Give the backbone structure.
Amino acid sequence: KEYLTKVDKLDASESLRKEEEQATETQPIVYGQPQLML
Amino acid sequence: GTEWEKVAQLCDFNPKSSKQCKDVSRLRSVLMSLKQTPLSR
């Protein structure tokens, strides 16, 4: 049962990994800095 | 069935142990004790 709780924590970590993937997909927005045209 | 009754009378993992630190391991132990309780006959 404790290991099943750890598996639930692993699923939460997978959700955090999906959040990191979303952050990576949004990174091109921050990468588009207008100051790079100088 | 009397051995389980003796083990309970000696060390019943009653949910009253929640007065201590709210550790997840102790919560899972209390859950296991509550799931084993129906075995008492």
User: Anything to note?
Assistant: Chain B touches chain A through five residues (CB under 8 Å). Chain B is about 55% helix and 0% strand.
